[PDB]
Amino acid sequence: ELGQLQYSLDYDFQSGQLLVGILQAMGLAALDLGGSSDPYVRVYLLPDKRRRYETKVHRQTLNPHFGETFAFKVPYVELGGRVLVMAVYDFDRFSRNDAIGEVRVPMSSVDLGRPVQAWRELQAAP
Ligand SMILES: [Ca+2]
Ligand SMILES: [Ca+2]
Ligand SMILES: [Ca+2]
């Protein structure tokens, strides 16, 4: 049980940018021995691994409220070949940050004629 993430997708057709809102997560796995996590989300639009953004870290919670929005410049015609990755991590002070899980959204599975808001279960990295 890794939890789930609520996100929004909004394609701004005038600017040619995909707006990705990271709203909140719920029921996240605890990646600290004390039974909690310090969650943040790294967001990137595959296959571009260079343009990556990270939310603020939230302290000791498995139900973080993020309220972040990032965007990626991508022509609408190319969008179906992109895969959005929202990778949820647990920030640590004394060791590497820990993967909690990720949500992968093949953009071909979304219709962005109008904006969408959805929940998806976190999965282990492939
Ligand atoms: Ca940890
Ligand atoms: Ca931690
Ligand atoms: Ca760690």
Determination technique for this PDB entry?
X-ray
Among residues 37, 65, 66, 62, which one has the least CA distance to residue 54? Answer: 66
8 phi and psi, to 5 degrees?
A: -125, 150
CA of 95 to the centre of ligand 3 (A): 4
Is it true that the peptide bond before 47 is cis, omega within 30 degrees of 0?
yes
Closest listed ligand to the CA of 36: 2
Closest listed ligand to the CA of 37: 2
Token digits for 108? 């071909």
What is the span of the domain harbouring residue 72?
1-126
The total domain count for the chain is 1
What 3-state class would DSSP assign to 52?
strand
**Helix or strand run (H / E) with residue 26:** strand 17-26
Distance, C-alpha 120 to centroid of its chain:
10
CA of 101 to the centre of ligand 3 (A): 14
Among residues 11, 22, 30, which one has the least CA distance to residue 85? Answer: 22
CA dist., res. 121 & res. 26, Å (int): 9
Q: Which residues contact 121 (CB under 8 A, 6 or more apart)?
A: 2, 3, 4, 103
CA of 25 to the centre of ligand 1 (A): 17
Among residues 16, 51, 34, which one has the least CA distance to residue 92? Answer: 34
CATH number for the domain including 1? 2.60.40.150
